[PDB]
Structure 1
Amino acid sequence: MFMINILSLIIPILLAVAFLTLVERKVLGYMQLRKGPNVVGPYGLLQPIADALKLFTKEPLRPATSSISMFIIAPILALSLALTMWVPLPMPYPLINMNLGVLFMLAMSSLAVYSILWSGWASNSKYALIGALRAVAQTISYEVTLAIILLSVLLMNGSYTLSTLITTQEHIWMIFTSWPLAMMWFISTLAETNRAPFDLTEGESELVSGFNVEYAAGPFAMFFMAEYANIIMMNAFTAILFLGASHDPHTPELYTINFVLKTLALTITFLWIRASYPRFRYDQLMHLLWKSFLPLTLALCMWHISLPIMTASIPPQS
């Protein structure tokens, strides 16, 4: 009965991911004075299915100079981690109830970068190597600021348990207490998921395709699935962290609907941002994260440590 729950978690996420691509194509089209897919099925509803079937019936190729083991391993790691990172999310109940869900999510995020790194290295191509090194630089840019922002925000929660975030935001959204950090956190997510304006690991206009230039058909589709799943997952995490839906223990579907709508709003905001802005230079991203985000993050961490002691508002559950 637990396997049924695992499947009911993972399959709808993939279905959601497939449809997310259709939505982005349409949203991008209408923001660009066009329509997007509206021919394959009504309103392009069959377009993701056609894309998946085309990708999984095409010939995959092994580069002659590539390292086969790592080349095959990297997409499996990417997709498996993208699927795994959904299990502690309370919606309003988690599939896996952890005492430390935030730290688990951080560790799995840190492990997810190695799919990009090993695909770029094992491709044995110059553009893939450039993309992998850009991924290294991106992680060095965002990691510490992201972690300290998480710590500062969770100082108001009292623990690292995700479900407690529902109780913390019972009467007011946490954003109203931490709207500055939230903005930075949002930007960090954009850097964490390699999304525009920080789409540097792929960098289509500069590196052709970056780390996944040598990948074709099914492994490439798996990389795409993992990236879009990570986008949806991080927006869901942001919605849980900063926009707390009211939970009724006898009517959890209300919480589920609220949470899903907030997550969809955040994802559409991601697509909007992609439609609106140019691309950073990957040294400018590091300078932004280390010379602007880090000092404010440290000062706000100091302030958020001092604040509950000052006002006698320390949360329970040591």
Structure 2
Amino acid sequence: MFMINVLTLIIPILLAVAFLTLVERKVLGYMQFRKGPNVVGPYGLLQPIADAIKLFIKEPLRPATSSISMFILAPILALTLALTMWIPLPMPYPLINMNLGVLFMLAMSSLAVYSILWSGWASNSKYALIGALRAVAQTISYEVTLAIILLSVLLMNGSFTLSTLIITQEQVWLIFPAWPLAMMWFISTLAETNRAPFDLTEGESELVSGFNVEYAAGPFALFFMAEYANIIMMNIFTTTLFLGAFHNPYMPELYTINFTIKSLLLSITFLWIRASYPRFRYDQLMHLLWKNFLPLTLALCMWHVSLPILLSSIPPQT
């Protein structure tokens, strides 16, 4: 009966992506002193359905100069990669109980850029090439910091399993002994998912649309849902990493309620962040992450290496 579990994992996150678009437009209007979409349905509840049907009855409009192989291969790979790393998340019991789920998340997150590169190179245009180059620079910036953030936060967990991450929260949150690393991790999740002020690929003022500027409707919606599943899942991962809740084996309802509310609040905070700051230049992206973030996280990494030896607090690996 794993098929039913897989379907119930993969369909409601797509529905969550659609209603994330709804509340995205609503809240993003609301801090701009205007209302959101509320004409189509009662408080605009039918906006995602109209958006989804509208993109799928348009014309795909494949370009002549585009190499059709990677042009048709990039969005499906993007949607699959945004979908395939949801499994090791404990919810409170994960789909697949992998001992090294952090490594799986890291490797499938490294794979997620390849759809952007193949969509940039497959379409023959200068804007797609510039978007691919900026995505490459964004990956250069964020990977070498994000790996060390995850390792140094994970050093008190004792193992790479995400199931044992819920055990460590039973006394106190790990955001209290690792609040600077929490700031580093939040900026890194801002940078990875390509959300403002770290967008730099789907630019409106710099480029037209960047990596998918030649992508018409149908294939374009896959990148949209992939990015929104990415941000929802990344906020769920941050919630599990730093603000893990109280788990009771006899009632999973408590933990589902708690992490759902916490991840929803973190996504609202992400929406709050994404439209209050100017967009960064991509030359200042590695003038910050390679210059200010890296020495600080090296110092904190060696501090978290030498800290359980200091206090005699070596965590168990099991």
Residue identity opposite 2:205 in structure 1: S
Specify the alignment match of 1:123 in structure 2.
Answer: 123
> 1:68-217, aligned counterparts within 5 Å?
68-217=68-217
Distance across 2 between alignment mates of 1:33 and 1:155? 44
Residue identity opposite 1:74 in structure 2: A
What is the CA distance between 1:36 and its match in structure 2? 0.9
Distance across 1 between alignment mates of 2:296 and 2:222? 37
> 1:56-75, aligned counterparts within 5 Å?
56-75=56-75
Residue identity opposite 2:176 in structure 1: F
Specify the alignment match of 1:2 in structure 2.
Answer: 2
What is the CA distance between 1:118 and its match in structure 2? 0.3
Specify the alignment match of 1:28 in structure 2.
Answer: 28
Residue aligned with 2:291, SS: helix
Specify the alignment match of 1:281 in structure 2.
Answer: 281
Q: After superposition, give the CA deviation of every residue in 1:253-289 in whole Å (9 maximum; x if it has no partner).
A: 1101101111111111111011211100001011110
Specify the alignment match of 1:267 in structure 2.
Answer: 267
Q: After superposition, give the CA deviation of every residue in 1:222-281 in whole Å (9 maximum; x if it has no partner).
A: 010000000000000000000010000000111011011111111111110112111000
Q: Structure 2: where are the runs of 5+ without partners?
A: none
Specify the alignment match of 2:316 in structure 1.
Answer: 316
Residue aligned with 2:220, SS: helix
Specify the alignment match of 1:232 in structure 2.
Answer: 232
Q: After superposition, give the CA deviation of every residue in 1:119-139 in whole Å (9 maximum; x if it has no partner).
A: 010011110110011000000
Residue identity opposite 2:270 in structure 1: F
Residue identity opposite 1:163 in structure 2: S
Distance across 2 between alignment mates of 1:2 and 1:288? 45
Residue identity opposite 1:238 in structure 2: T
Specify the alignment match of 2:241 in structure 1.
Answer: 241
Q: Structure 1: where are the runs of 5+ without partners?
A: none
What is the CA distance between 1:195 and its match in structure 2? 0.5
Residue aligned with 2:98, SS: coil
Distance across 1 between alignment mates of 2:317 and 2:209? 48
Residue identity opposite 1:89 in structure 2: L
Residue identity opposite 1:265 in structure 2: L
Residue aligned with 1:95, SS: coil
Distance across 2 between alignment mates of 1:317 and 1:297? 24
Residue identity opposite 2:43 in structure 1: Y
Q: After superposition, give the CA deviation of every residue in 1:96-125 in whole Å (9 maximum; x if it has no partner).
A: 110000110000000000000000100111
What is the CA distance between 1:177 and its match in structure 2? 0.7
Residue identity opposite 1:11 in structure 2: I
User: Could you state the TM-score of these two structures normalised by the residue count of structure 2?
Assistant: 0.99
What is the CA distance between 1:307 and its match in structure 2? 0.5
What is the CA distance between 1:189 and its match in structure 2? 0.4
Q: After superposition, give the CA deviation of every residue in 1:17-45 in whole Å (9 maximum; x if it has no partner).
A: 00000101000111000011011110001
The alignment yields a C-alpha RMSD, in angstroms, of 0.6
Distance across 2 between alignment mates of 1:118 and 1:74? 6
Distance across 1 between alignment mates of 2:52 and 2:138? 29
Q: After superposition, give the CA deviation of every residue in 1:38-84 in whole Å (9 maximum; x if it has no partner).
A: 11110001000000000000000111110000000000000011111
Residue aligned with 1:287, SS: coil
Distance across 2 between alignment mates of 1:31 and 1:248? 38
**Matched residues, number:** 318
Specify the alignment match of 2:50 in structure 1.
Answer: 50
Distance across 1 between alignment mates of 2:253 and 2:98? 22
Residue identity opposite 2:139 in structure 1: T
Residue identity opposite 2:162 in structure 1: L
What is the CA distance between 1:303 and its match in structure 2? 0.3
What is the CA distance between 1:204 and its match in structure 2? 1.3
- Stretch of structure 1 that moved more, 2-11 or 265-274: 265-274
Q: After superposition, give the CA deviation of every residue in 1:180-237 in whole Å (9 maximum; x if it has no partner).
A: 0110100000100001001101111111000010111111000100000000000000
Specify the alignment match of 2:253 in structure 1.
Answer: 253
Tell me if 1:12 matches 2:12: yes
Residue aligned with 1:58, SS: coil
